[PDB]
């Protein structure tokens, strides 16, 4: 479909470029169980 100079009579095949991808990273809340209470024993000092 060329002209006499070999130039194309058609409009060229266009291609719209891809959009830039949005970056995304992993986000996690920290996980952790509580610590149990230590054992008991009666002291030598009174309560006050």
Binding residues for another protein (CB under 8 A): 41, 43-45
DSSP string, 1-48: -B-TTS-BSSPP---PPPPPPPP---------PPPPPPP----SS---
The Cα 12–Cα 1 span in angstroms is 12
Q: Of 2 and 40, which has the nearer Cβ to another protein?
A: 40
Considering the complex, what minimum distance in angstroms separates the CB of residue 39 from another protein? 11
Supply the minimum distance, in Å, between the C-beta of residue 45 and another protein: 7
Tell me how far, at minimum, the Cβ of 34 lies from another protein, in Å.
22
């Amino acid at each position: 479909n060329l002209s006499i100079d070999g130039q194309p009579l058609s409009l060229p095949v266009f291609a719209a470029p891809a959009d830039p991808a949005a970056l995304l990273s992993a986000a996690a809340a920290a996980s952790g169980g509580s610590k149990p209470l230590p054992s008991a024993d009666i002291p030598a000092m009174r309560f006050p």
